[PDB]
Symmetry: C2
Subunit: 252 residues, 2 copies
Amino acid sequence: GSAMGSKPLRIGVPNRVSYTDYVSKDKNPPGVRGYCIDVFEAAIELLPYPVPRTYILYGDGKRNPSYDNLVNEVVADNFDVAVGDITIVTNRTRYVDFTQPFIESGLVVVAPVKEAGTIEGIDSLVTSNEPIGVQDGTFARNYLINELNILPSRIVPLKDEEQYLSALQRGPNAGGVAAIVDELPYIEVLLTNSNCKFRTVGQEFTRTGWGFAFQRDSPLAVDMSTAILQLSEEGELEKIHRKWLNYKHECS
Amino acid sequence: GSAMGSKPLRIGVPNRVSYTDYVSKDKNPPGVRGYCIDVFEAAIELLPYPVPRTYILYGDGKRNPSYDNLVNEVVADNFDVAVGDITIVTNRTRYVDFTQPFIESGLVVVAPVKEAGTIEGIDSLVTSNEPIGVQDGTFARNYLINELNILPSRIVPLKDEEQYLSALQRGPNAGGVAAIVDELPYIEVLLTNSNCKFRTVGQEFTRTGWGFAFQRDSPLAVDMSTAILQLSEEGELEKIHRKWLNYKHECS
């Protein structure tokens, strides 16, 4: 019979430095772990065919990588899929085939409790002209510039939870920010870890989700959407969420 | 030049008798109207090519039609797309290409305020062994049977808001139901119209969304997902929601 085997699915995984319960490196095979990996694996197990595969980390592990650059590595055929906390953003849907979302997402504004009389939501944050913290690597920076009219110099990329907290505590006149703009899944973790000093202000002012980003016309994208809906019906998406994420804390 | 023109996009639209602000017949061209039609049209307008099209009603206009049968009319090539309040259900994703969702959905339990000590959510409703009201035509009937272990004889299909309200008011021992199980978008309208006598009980116990159902491998599905995300960023999905749906009422 023919000697040459099939190439395995090349899975690109963002090498996250913050909010690592969503997805991160693992010292042990398969070399990655977290909520999005367990969902991906649970969905792979429901496909009606084997999927030989390997997980390849993307980023230097010092800062969160560019998620737009990770998605374009799929577009450029360096990976077959991007697996992780990959937001379903307009520009990315032009070039990859996302699954149906496996978790809902949306941007929120986070500010100190003491500041909520002047920063009440995205509209007051826009007109404040104060600095706005964001993660490294997120779609949110270009979203703020292009959709919310934020002057680019106002956007302050921050490395990790210690810096998210430091920047909010210092505030806008002492080298920090008026607010952080980030997706609600991350903020649920940040508020779990910050002793009731910060809160969301105003409406979740965008709505989308996270999906797995396959190449254009991939039959895996179709079959993994069906599998994600199966996990959702079975209660498995909720079980996997409970395994990795807990938003209960002491001060409330 | 060649005489024979292109066939227009055949759009199948459910001929709804209840919750007609989501989608329904219109006496005036294009012969259909509502929230899902305005979203579809707004998304069509963002595509980088014209899409000659026509809207064809599906159902006798006496009861809500079978949404599974509407989706299978796309699969069977009688329509090119199903446009309306089409839930993204596991079985349907095997055969059609849904867009990314344009609105979040999920099932909820609705019961009289007075009954919330015995019916507190889906778990207590399951174990109650009492009758459960559902819409005509919804995925929810088979969902309850197959995912929640409901004996089929317990499920009572109801025609319209007058019957949803009548069945809850009569209750389970006087020819009515213990609860209605339906998607939250419909229940938001029902509670707007029912004078604070009924409420949701327990968690929204499923999560998915509504999408437009194109044929397998349709390039329109790809490009209309991009367009839906554009409408979401621009705030147009919110503007269209506000045009059609208002959940404010007098008793609260």
